[PDB]
């Protein structure tokens, strides 16, 4: 509350730390797609279904230009991704299968780096 603080966890080494996080995600070789905005004139129904698209791509753009206020709005954006990825493919294809994998990677090196 006012005048009454909890101790000061050190936040200086954030930005490094989810661009390093960032940097793995980028290069798993299940990341293919998730890497660029799904392109909304090609994908039927995309545009109308997933109100929020998000893209490891969008990510990297708003990590380098100060867009994330904190850590936890960093994870809630590649949660999305994941998130929407669900919500389109069916668990038993290609790209379902590939956003679960990239959804367990994720939150074990988030788990390891900041837990």
């Known amino acids: 509350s006012m005048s009454v603080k909890k101790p ?4 200086s080494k954030d930005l490094a730390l989810c661009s390093m996080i960032l940097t793995e995600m980028e290069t798993h070789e299940d990341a293919w ?4 905005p799904v392109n909304l004139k090609l994908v039927p129904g995309y545009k109308k279904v997933i109100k929020k698209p998000m893209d490891f791509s969008t990510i990297r753009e708003k990590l380098s ?15 999305l991704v994941f998130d929407n990825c669900e919500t389109f493919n069916e668990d038993d ?7 679960h994998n990239m959804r367990k990677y994720f939150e074990k090196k988030w788990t390891d780096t900041f837990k």
Request: hydrophobic share 35%; aromatic share 10%; proline share 7%.
């Open 8 to 11: 000061k966890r050190d936040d």
């Open 33 to 36: 797609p998730f890497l660029l």
């Open 65 to 79: 230009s100060g867009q994330y206020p904190n850590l936890e709005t960093f994870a809630l954006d590649v949660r």
């Open 93 to 99: 294809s290609d790209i379902g299968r590939a956003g």
